[PDB]
Design a protein around this ligand. Structure first.
Ligand SMILES: N[C@@H](Cc1ccc(O)cc1)C(=O)O
Lengths: 360, 339
């Protein structure tokens, strides 16, 4: 415990002295940071100086995640093997409301048995992914230390009982609705005329409260998809406010030092040229392999950096061979193999890669 | 047992009302001049009270340690409701209201509302209304549910079905900044009603300025009842006689009901200064005096209004209602002994 703080301090000096990379500099090299919700240099300083907690959220709208969810979790995977405490947040409660961002119409009311089934399946998959990350990290030389920590939490833990009055007192009373109505997501649904419910309008405050609940236990940073910039931005402000105005003395903190203020960033948007599920029963291992081998030549190098733990030198070596003759798909096959191994294990990766070569 | 006998008693009244032999609670209040606007259909309101011994409530926000005379008319309606055998509820908005100040006001107002409840019963006794087992009056602080009510529950049963567009259109809201908490207040008021509606409070009465709030409440309660996931509470309210509905009382420094803020003598004086052209209406609204007795008073008043016979009767009655007979006797004598 104490040794951890000393180790991170040593790393900090080595980072400033150009002998080591910070977590931010590392992610930038992997191409995993799109936008920083706040000041990039501050984010860098925070991770350099502090072994801060970081989390990513996911709402269970399906029994399975797909490849489109992965980049924020690739960030947490890196965080985990870097010895940062990471948290996977399952939005069991917030999924009932539905995130209005990147939508004009409202989500369709799903039956309760379906939502419960989706939530349970996603919970298992996230547990499985957590163990896979450790295994996959091991393959690439990252040996688990006692100080490592990964957590899976359902926000139902608090949303099932959290009184409306508590949220209004500690957060709602300090939030002006004017700016909320100015946000793009709301503005576009009022202008277009798609309408919007009170529940949807409240969603940002729920996400903010989620962060606050984790922030109290050291989770200073949030990472999300590209379209989550707005929610994370709102969250940064909201968390400062709660910490500054909370009536509980055990939790109250002005956060005067910038190094302690909440901050976040987004991961890049994946574009194409249905869904690619991480569940073997929905998308076979063979088909997940196929999806990645079809990665365009002008995208495969970046994907190798974002979707695998392959060292940069090894990626350079792969690309050197790839650039000589990309028809052999050396880069695409390495990408497909690594990601299939991460999600479904080595045996699956070996089987589908052999069968794919024998067939095509 | 008594429940079944109660429905029978109300059934008899209903038949007699249709035959023009008895007044409904609505017709009665109109005779008193206590109804300003009906949030909904007047005839429906008449029908609801004719057919059903419905619950009715009025809300009060503890922004002061005491209520004053400007708050009374909705409570006069509840006073009548009580002695008519309708179950009435006083809702104290403890949750929705420095912190040490707010808690003290809430406690003082709660104490005053209990006292008013007992005073209403006593005052009813004087005018021939004898308490029956079926009578019911309740004082409730909405803190009772707001202390635990999950945000998620409100969003599911209400928040999901309310569009913010219209809310931003409300008169009070459009002409404005505003906090999220303040923006949420209308839904909390609606939820308050829903909590009481589940236990029979189909009707709400409020001040003249409460038309908007009651209007929003009717729609919200319909919505919640129609879409709530607990089937034990779910109900489409297809029959109009079961739909939530309300009405307002007419529009009249402050004349407090707290003796330490406004002396009984000064409360007496205030009503004695009631204008000649208003005193008759006030007698009907602020007292239980039968109309025939009010007629006898006004005709005598009309002989020589300088004697203020009507104003003195009004002042005495209201002081007795709020502070009791001994107080009424004392201040009336002191006023005569002085003037
Ligand atoms: N709102 C995010 C998921 C999320 C949920 C809760 C949080 O606290 C954070 C993120 C999404 O829909 O992608």
């Amino acid at each position: 415990i104490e040794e951890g703080k000393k180790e991170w301090a040593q790393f900090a000096q080595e980072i400033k002295e150009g002998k080591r990379k910070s977590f931010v500099e590392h992610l930038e090299e992997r191409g995993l940071i799109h936008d920083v919700v706040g000041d990039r240099d501050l984010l860098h300083r925070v991770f350099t100086e502090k072994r801060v907690g970081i989390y990513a959220g996911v709402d269970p709208t399906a029994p399975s995640m797909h490849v489109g969810h992965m980049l924020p979790f690739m960030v947490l995977a890196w965080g985990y093997v870097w010895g940062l405490p990471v948290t996977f947040l399952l939005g069991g409660a917030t999924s009932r409301v539905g995130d209005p961002t990147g939508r004009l119409k409202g989500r369709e009311q799903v039956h309760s048995s379906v939502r419960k089934a989706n939530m349970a399946s996603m919970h298992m998959q996230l547990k499985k992914l957590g163990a896979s990350i450790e295994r996959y990290g091991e393959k690439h030389g990252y040996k688990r230390q006692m100080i490592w920590r990964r957590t899976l939490t359902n926000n139902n833990v608090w949303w099932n009982k959290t009184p409306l009055l508590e949220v209004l007192r500690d957060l709602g009373a300090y939030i002006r609705i004017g700016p909320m109505l100015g946000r793009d997501t709301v503005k576009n649904r009022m202008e277009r005329g798609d309408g919007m419910s009170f529940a949807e309008f409240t969603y940002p405050l729920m996400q903010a409260w989620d962060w606050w609940m984790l922030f109290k236990n050291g989770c200073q940073v949030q990472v999300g998809g590209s379209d989550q910039y707005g929610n994370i931005l709102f969250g940064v402000g909201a968390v400062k406010t709660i910490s500054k105005n909370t009536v509980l003395q055990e939790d109250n903190n002005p956060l005067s030092d910038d190094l302690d203020k909440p901050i976040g960033f987004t991961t890049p948007l994946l574009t194409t040229s249905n869904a690619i599920w991480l569940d073997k029963d929905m998308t076979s291992t063979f088909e997940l392999y196929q999806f990645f081998v079809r990665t365009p030549d002008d995208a495969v190098e970046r994907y190798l950096k974002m979707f695998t733990f392959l060292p940069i030198p090894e990626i350079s070596k792969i690309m050197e061979e790839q650039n000589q003759d990309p028809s052999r798909r050396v880069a695409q096959h390495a990408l497909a193999y690594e990601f299939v191994e991460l999600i479904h294990g080595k045996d699956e990766a070996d089987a589908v890669s052999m069968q794919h070569r024998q067939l095509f």
